Design a protein around this ligand. Structure first.
Ligand SMILES: Nc1nc2c(ncn2[C@@H]2O[C@H](COP(=O)(O)O)[C@@H](O)[C@H]2O)c(=O)[nH]1
Ligand SMILES: Nc1nc2c(ncn2[C@@H]2O[C@H](COP(=O)(O)O)[C@@H](O)[C@H]2O)c(=O)[nH]1
Lengths: 190, 190
């Protein structure tokens, strides 16, 4: 999206050659209109895939995912952080290593919100090493649901996440693909 | 909001005398259409208040706040969990005791996303004891901004939150008001 690309160029802040900060419009402060466009762009790409539900992870993935679900007319389920001490009957879980925090946590979704008849569209804000995406894929398959694809708002093409993810055979749609972050500048994939 | 009250009646699950679960459409799985209606209702109520920004807290408040922001045409800033062990200046913080998790945590907002020029609409999913609301109000005042009011999706009128905020001179707009959760049933305020 030229709209997303421009937002990144003028508002994004290059933390290092490995991290891009977009707190002004995606990760802390949210630009609703831009989110609507993002959701519409995602819906367009999966319009005829027969998606029945969208799955994301709290909390940055929520806005993009909700707008997408609004356009496609399907519910949105967001995975939540978990680790608690008790018996959670029918709870889909997965271990995810945070790329930005370098810590490991467990994400989860109540089994009751996903069924083997669901054809899911996974959505998330960033794609780096692919940990979060794999985690989501794992949760969806645990419910016996099928996966129509993976929508990413910003993908760092220079990181292994993308290549490792497409190995599974799931269609990966990244709205903005960054080739480099070197020299405090964002260069998109040509 | 009749549409919201019906959702609560048919899908809401009374957990205890103090907690209502609505994981099927508001807190885990999200119903986008309903979120949009909720967003428009809030926007309608504050249509002429001169709102410049919305402030909420991750993660359940995000969806209702974003739709409100889309309708009103303003940005949405969501407070995030923060380690009192961290630093970062200009950072606006508050201490919130989670009604449902029953644990204390620090929430924070980058001071760059709020200015004394702002006129804020605070939004959250539930109102119980007023803990989260008090945290957002503190953060907003820390930035020197003014407050139009607090939009709440589901209020438990039988708990102290609303009375406390009202007594403090804050406008409270709750779309659904519950008078009691006793006997495992939802009874709205008449
Ligand atoms: N803000 C921001 N978050 C990132 C960036 N790269 C990765 N992440 C965070 O890390 C997760 C993606 O990492 P991955 O699972 O792909 O290894 C996302 O949930 C996201 O919050 C980045 O450049 N900027
Ligand atoms: N799902 C759910 N969350 C609640 C309920 N009561 C309080 N909360 C949670 O607690 C916060 C409100 O509590 P308060 O800050 O007003 O004491 C909200 O952010 C919400 O996540 C409830 O009955 N059901």
């Amino acid at each position: 999206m030229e709209a997303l690309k421009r937002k990144i160029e003028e508002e994004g802040v290059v933390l290092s050659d490995q991290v891009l900060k977009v707190d002004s419009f995606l990760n802390h402060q949210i630009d609703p209109l831009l989110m609507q466009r993002i959701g519409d762009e995602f819906a367009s790409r999966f319009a005829k895939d027969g998606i029945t539900k969208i799955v994301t992870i709290e909390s940055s993935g929520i806005a993009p995912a909700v707008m997408t679900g609004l356009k496609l007319g399907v519910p949105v389920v967001f995975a939540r952080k978990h680790k608690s001490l008790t018996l959670t009957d029918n709870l889909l879980t997965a271990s995810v290593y945070s790329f930005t925090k370098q810590t490991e946590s467990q994400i989860a979704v109540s089994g009751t919100h996903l069924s083997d008849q669901d054809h899911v569209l996974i959505i998330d804000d960033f794609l780096a090493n692919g940990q979060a995406a794999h985690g989501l894929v794992s949760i969806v398959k645990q419910a016996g649901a099928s996966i129509a694809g993976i929508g990413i708002v910003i993908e760092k093409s220079f990181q292994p996440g993308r290549d490792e993810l497409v190995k599974l055979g799931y269609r990966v749609e990244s709205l903005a693909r960054i080739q480099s972050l070197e020299e405090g500048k964002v260069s998109f994939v040509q």
